[PDB]
Amino acid sequence: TCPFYKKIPGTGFTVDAFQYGVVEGCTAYFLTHFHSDHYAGLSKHFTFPVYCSEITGNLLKNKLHVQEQYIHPLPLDTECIVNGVKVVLLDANHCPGAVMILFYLPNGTVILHTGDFRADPSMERSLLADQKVHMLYLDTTYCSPEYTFPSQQEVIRFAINTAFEAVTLNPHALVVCGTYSIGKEKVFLAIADVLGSKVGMSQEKYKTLQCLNIPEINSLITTDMCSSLVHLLPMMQINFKGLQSHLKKCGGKYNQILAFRPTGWTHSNKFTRIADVIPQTKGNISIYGIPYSEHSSYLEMKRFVQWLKPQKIIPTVNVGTWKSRSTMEKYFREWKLEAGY
Ligand code: NI
Numbered sequence: 001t002c003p004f005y006k007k008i009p010g011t012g013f014t015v016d017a018f019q020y021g022v023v024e025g026c027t028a029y030f031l032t033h034f035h036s037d038h039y040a041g042l043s044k045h046f047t048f049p050v051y052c053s054e055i056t057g058n059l060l061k062n063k064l065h066v067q068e069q070y071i072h073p074l075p076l077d078t079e080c081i082v083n084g085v086k087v088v089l090l091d092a093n094h095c096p097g098a099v100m101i102l103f104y105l106p107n108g109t110v111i112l113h114t115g116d117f118r119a120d121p122s123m124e125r126s127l128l129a130d131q132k133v134h135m136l137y138l139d140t141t142y143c144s145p146e147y148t149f150p151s152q153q154e155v156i157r158f159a160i161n162t163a164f165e166a167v168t169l170n171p172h173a174l175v176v177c178g179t180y181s182i183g184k185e186k187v188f189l190a191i192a193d194v195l196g197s198k199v200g201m202s203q204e205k206y207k208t209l210q211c212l213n214i215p216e217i218n219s220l221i222t223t224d225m226c227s228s229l230v231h232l233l234p235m236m237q238i239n240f241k242g243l244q245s246h247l248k249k250c251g252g253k254y255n256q257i258l259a260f261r262p263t264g265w266t267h268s269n270k271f272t273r274i275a276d277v278i279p280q281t282k283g284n285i286s287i288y289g290i291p292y293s294e295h296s297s298y299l300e301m302k303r304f305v306q307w308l309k310p311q312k313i314i315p316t317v318n319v320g321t322w323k324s325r326s327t328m329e330k331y332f333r334e335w336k337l338e339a340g341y
Pocket of ligand 1: 033035094
């Protein structure tokens with residue numbers, strides 16, 4: 001049964017609610033982004049209208065085989081009417097195709113559902129600037145002040161400088177990057193660009209990337225592993241055993257691996273600067289954990305909310321424990337008292 005924080009009152013709508021069977025009263029199912037915790041339940045046998053971005057609709061059709069007649073892609077930054085209700089999709093600064101949804105209820109209430117997002121000051125100049133929001137359904141993944149991490153631009157600068165140094169010192173080093181979902185593509189694309197290489201990967205990952213409308217993608221990626229010195233592997237294989245095994249397969253072309261695991265936050269963030277990050281090393285293999293986040297830090301989240309000034313906040317993450325819920329409610333009240341709304 002569908003939980004309340006996935007229902008939009010005063011509508012026939014749900015958000016990211018595909019794992020509950022047929023939801024009573026639902027006339028349109030919205031999908032914010034193509035991550036498995038949110039799409040859980042969708043398949044070629046789904047027969048209700050799914051509303052989403054163009055990129056999400058490419059992935060639904062090609063990866064999950066949802067039939068075309070049920071996919072309803074909407075342009076961004078554009079007022080659209082769905083089952084008699086005005087909606088707008090906004091870029092969420094999460095993974096490719098990820099959106100926030102603005103719903104203009106028939107009674108005058110305005111609701112923003114962030115989906116998953118990484119808040120940014122640029123959002124203060126979208127279509128959000130133009131009217132008041134009563135209710136905010138908020139991605140609270142890192143809603144606590146201990147969650148700090150650098151900008152994506154600092155993290156990419158570290159990755160590129162690290163990879164370029166290693167491979168210039170040793171032209172026989174291979175670079176490997178972990179992945180297990182869409183998102184974080186800048187990591188492996190920026191490294192391959194500094195090295196003058198395409199990114200090599202499995203046919204299944206190449207297929208996924210070909211759905212993302214990335215400019216000039218045919219120039220950046222390939223399934224010919226032998227032509228590439230940046231390889232993508234499943235996240236589960238980014239360990240000393242799995243990387244040793246991969247190095248065997250390359251037919252003595254390489255004699256060293258430099259590997260990256262983009263994580264979200266880890267507790268080595270509470271002590272160490274990005275500049276000071278070091279790898280774990282075993283023989284000719286080194287593994288870097290880099291804190292590349294596609295979710296808001298605490299301070300980015302707090303800035304967004306204090307700017308938006310919502311009347312009510314509904315968290316969508318960390319909702320399963322009383323201790324989490326009570327922590328989050330305390331920060332919401334602080335923010336409201338400090339800013340005066
Ligand atoms: Ni996500």
